[PDB]
């Protein structure tokens, strides 16, 4: 929580450094939806991938996050985010606008930046959400309390590599299925591992169902990831 002679925040810099070793997560914003994909760092045959959750968390019915960093620090912040959403809904009888929830979380992080003598949370988030003001939105926050919005973005390990690729293949008039594909390809080329299997992945989409008028959050089952791997030719 102190400044360097250069005007930088030691503990913050070092926290970003911590994150740079965490499994990669990618957010891609389409025209008709949003993709979240994330790579599980350190796996084993015995690790129970079925009843598992470590990188993709539901915040709300309209908002999900992807986590890079310390899992336990993340649960702390997810939990208070879930509560802030509910307070907003109780107060106003309207689901919380994505930006507002994101601003709140960033503010909490910024706090540890500026007072109390406690270590910052070693966590970066990608936020995928929908609201009636701006429709689909993608956000990112890191230990500095800073947040920004994106068409596509990545966090954790190998962001320079992954960033370049997304910049190369993303286009404004994309569709969700293409974004799913783009997400998988990008993780496919930045993995620190042999090849991309299903047990090393978490996957989620936010789509405005063509039959209805309401928004659906899907967190892909193990078998569903396995399938979406074959279609795009990674078998």
């Amino acid at each position: 929580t102190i400044f360097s002679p250069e005007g930088r925040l030691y503990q913050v810099e070092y926290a970003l450094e911590s994150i740079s070793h965490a499994g990669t997560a990618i957010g891609i914003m389409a025209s008709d939806g949003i993709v979240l994909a994330a790579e599980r760092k350190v796996t084993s045959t015995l690790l129970e991938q079925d009843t598992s959750t470590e990188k993709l968390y539901k915040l709300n019915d309209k908002i999900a996050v992807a986590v890079a960093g310390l899992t336990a620090d993340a649960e702390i912040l997810i939990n208070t985010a879930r509560i802030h959403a509910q307070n907003y809904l109780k107060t106003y009888n309207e689901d919380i606008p994505v930006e507002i929830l994101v601003r709140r979380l960033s503010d909490i992080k910024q706090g540890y930046t500026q007072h109390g003598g406690l270590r910052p949370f070693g966590v970066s988030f990608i936020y995928a959400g929908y609201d009636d003001r701006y429709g689909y939105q993608l956000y990112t926050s890191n230990p500095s309390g800073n947040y920004t919005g994106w068409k596509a973005i990545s966090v954790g390990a190998n962001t320079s590599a992954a960033q370049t690729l997304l910049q190369m293949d993303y286009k404004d008039d994309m569709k969700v299925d293409d974004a799913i594909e783009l997400a998988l390809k990008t993780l496919s080329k930045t993995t620190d591992s042999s090849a991309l299997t299903y047990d090393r992945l978490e996957f989620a989409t936010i789509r405005k169902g063509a039959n209805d008028g309401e928004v659906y959050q899907k967190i892909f089952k193990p078998q569903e990831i396995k399938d979406i791997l074959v279609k795009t030719g990674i078998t």
């Binding site: 109780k90 107060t91 106003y92 009888n93 309207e94 606008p97 507002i100 009636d132 003001r133």
Partner: protein, 198 residues
Amino acid sequence: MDIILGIRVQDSVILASSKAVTRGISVLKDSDDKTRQLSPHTLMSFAGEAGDTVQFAEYIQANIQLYSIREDYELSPQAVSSFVRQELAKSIRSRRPYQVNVLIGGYDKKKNKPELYQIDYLGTKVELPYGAHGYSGFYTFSLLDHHYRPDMTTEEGLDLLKLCVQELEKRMPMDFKGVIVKIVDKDGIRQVDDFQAQ
């Protein structure tokens, strides 16, 4: 009791509020505006205990104005009303509750529909085609039950109010010194100054 009345026609909400302020044996003012603009499309009328009344309204006003600027966006009438309800429902169980009743009239631009909310000091909220606080409702509710129609024009709604006011000038014991009338539609909030002669 002060008269606060509200009626929502097809394309607007109309608020009418008594102009008298009476302490004890004297009418101190005959031109009081018992209303605060919450946002350019949302208006609140209020009546109740002497000090509580304006302090509550100004407190709600400051909170709503602050939200507007933080988000550069106007909250929906529904949202504003849920905020007011919760505020009242908190106060009902505190050491000294606000003794204030309110009507919230707003035009929801996202839905293009006018909305009227009635809320008492306990935090009892309800959405209605017409509403009133205090003794007023005892005369006007039946009037409107009879003469009201969902698809009235703003001009029809004002003639309906004239009727409401007339009944209250005929049968109510206190001289409430006429009403101030205000319209909330797609274009915001204006004050009909022509009510003392029509």
